[PDB]
Amino acid sequence: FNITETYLRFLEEDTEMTMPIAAIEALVTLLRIKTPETAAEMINTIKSSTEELIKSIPNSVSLRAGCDIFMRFVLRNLHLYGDWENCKQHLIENGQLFVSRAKKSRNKIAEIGVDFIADDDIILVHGYSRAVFSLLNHAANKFIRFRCVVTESRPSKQGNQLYTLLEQKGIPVTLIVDSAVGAVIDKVDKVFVGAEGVAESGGIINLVGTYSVGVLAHNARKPFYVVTESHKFVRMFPLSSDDLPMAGPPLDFTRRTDDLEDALRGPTIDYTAQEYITALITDLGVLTPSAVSEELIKMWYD
Amino acid sequence: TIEPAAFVLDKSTSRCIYYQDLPLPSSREKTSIQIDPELLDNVDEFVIRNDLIDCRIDICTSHVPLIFQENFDYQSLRTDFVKGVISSDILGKHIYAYLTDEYAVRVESWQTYDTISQDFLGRWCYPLVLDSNIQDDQTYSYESRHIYKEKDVVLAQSCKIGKCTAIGSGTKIGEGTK
Incomplete structure (x- = not known):
């Protein structure tokens, strides 16, 4: 029941609500029309919607991942096997509930991930992820000891936008080019990378370069990072x-x-391996080594 | 200068022979060293020393307060007391002199106070720290490069510095300082 229109509506919005979140909400709304109980009508329709989304997609897997997550959640839902209405009601509820969860996640991040900042350590944020930016802002608010650094990213001028955003805060800003990143080996203290998807174990999708950065970090023995909120499990x-x-x-x-x-x-797209990253940043307690894979195993059982 | 005591000491029994305070490093007027002969031909192992520091910590037996009560001339406790002991006012009595290779100084003046503070800040005495927290409302934390910071403590970016700095709570520090 329409998804192309929704897609058209959301591309450069974000800020307030995460791009993926909106999609998830839309999916939930779609679900809450054809009844989740009648699995014959529902799952096929969901599949069709996913196909449509894929067709509309140029260079992304995040939306697909989100929808898969949603599907998994739905599957999990009916395991009470008693009264069939309560489950349906719960399903209906979990859409704006997901949106709400985001705030909570952010709050959690603002408490657990604020322990990292030490005496004179230069921070470089890669790509575009709202969560990382929020974390940075919260660190600034705390006034530990840092330096916020931007990049010359090239999709549809993202790096420049990020730089402009940083300028608003006031914190002194200097830039790193995609090529001129090579000189950075110990001076910028810790290498942070924002995520637009987290796969099995260490697999992360972002923008126009991450693997090279990871390699560089490995060469230098530098701490490499993956920073996100909660909506991307593939x-x-x-x-x-x-x-x-x-x-x-x-x-x-x-x-x-x-x-x-x-x-x-x-x-245009970039992946990262398991060996390069030292720390994983998610609101879900404090998990790092290979917890996402375990989560996936728990979920799918396939 | 206030307390450069020239302790003539024993190794076999660890017992004091002479006490003197001199203003010799500051005002060269009374440069003087004496060796008393009352305990000369009984000790034999005479050791002349000066390089020792005041602590003013005493473990006292049942003798001391009674002695004090007896003798009203001892209004002090260092210059009069040790000398009196040496002289045998209460005849034939022993005193101990504990000698430690590790550092021990008492609070006296202002430069000395500063030095003590510096020592405390560094790792000069075996465990002594502020970060461990002693008094209730304390929120002290240890940092690298011999730096002490409590909670509610902020220092701003771009301050090119030497070595060793410490800040108390409720502090806001600006930008660009040497």
């Missing part, structure tokens, strides 16, 4: 150095030209 694993669903072509040796037509093509 069952995924790649085979090569990098493997993902792609709309932007990998190594597209552009056709013979003289007056310019199409050129901006390459690895």
